Amino acid sequence: GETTDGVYRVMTRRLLGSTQVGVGVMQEGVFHTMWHVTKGAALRSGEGRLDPYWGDVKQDLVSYCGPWKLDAAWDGLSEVQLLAVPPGERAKNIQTLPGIFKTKDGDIGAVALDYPAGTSGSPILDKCGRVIGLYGNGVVIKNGSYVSAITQGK
Amino acid sequence: DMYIERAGDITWEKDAEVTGNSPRLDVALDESGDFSLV
Numbered sequence: 001g002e003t004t005d006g007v008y009r010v011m012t013r014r015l016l017g018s019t020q021v022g023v024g025v026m027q028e029g030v031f032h033t034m035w036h037v038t039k040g041a042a043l044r045s046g047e048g049r050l051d052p053y054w055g056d057v058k059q060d061l062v063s064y065c066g067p068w069k070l071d072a073a074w075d076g077l078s079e080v081q082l083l084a085v086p087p088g089e090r091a092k093n094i095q096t097l098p099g100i101f102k103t104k105d106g107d108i109g110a111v112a113l114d115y116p117a118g119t120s121g122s123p124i125l126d127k128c129g130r131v132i133g134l135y136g137n138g139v140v141i142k143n144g145s146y147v148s149a150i151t152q153g154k
Numbered sequence: 155d156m157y158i159e160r161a162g163d164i165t166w167e168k169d170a171e172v173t174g175n176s177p178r179l180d181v182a183l184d185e186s187g188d189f190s191l192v
């Protein structure tokens with residue numbers, strides 16, 4: 001099927017009509033998404049099948065056809081762009097300055113942007129267009145707004 | 155059954171809409187991959 005680098009929608013026909021359950025990144029022949037989007041199930045790209053290669057529920061990540069290829073990291077200072085792919089809507093870039101998730105195991109960048117659940121897996125980019133992480137695993141704060149970690153493979 | 159459809163190229167776009175704040179939050183990550191506010 002399609003192996004071209006880029007951002008892709010993850011769809012299902014098991015519910016009413018065609019429903020977008022998430023988003024992913026194709027890079028160097030490997031498809032990258034969040035674990036909660038597919039639960040590690042196989043995917044279809046036209047007539048071709050993508051089998052899971054690596055997954056980790058705690059990181060909430062999964063790769064297909066090969067190992068995780070996204071290695072860029074947020075520099076901790078600069079603004080980044082969420083390349084949001086919302087259900088039924090065109091791919092759209094949103095620029096923001098990340099905040100921080102402070103954990104007992106270190107600090108992680110976080111983006112305070114609110115999108116429908118089916119937007120999970122959208123890539124976060126640096127100024128060179130490199131994917132520094134995936135959007136879609138985070139918390140709801142004291143207001144009701146959503147804050148996502150910048151989740152990158154470790 | 156799940157399938158994928160191409161949605162675009164991955165590129166930085168000059169003059170994208172600029173929004174969102176930068177909150178510093180103390181968080182915990184459990185064995186199930188869920189974040190929670192401490």
Ligand SMILES: CN1CCN(C(=O)c2ccc(F)c(F)c2)CC1
Pocket residue numbers: 053054063066067068069152153154
């Ligand atoms: C022997 N390998 C095969 C599978 N594997 C990955 O796919 C991987 C590589 C880099 C990452 F950052 C990551 F999150 C995951 C790790 C172990």
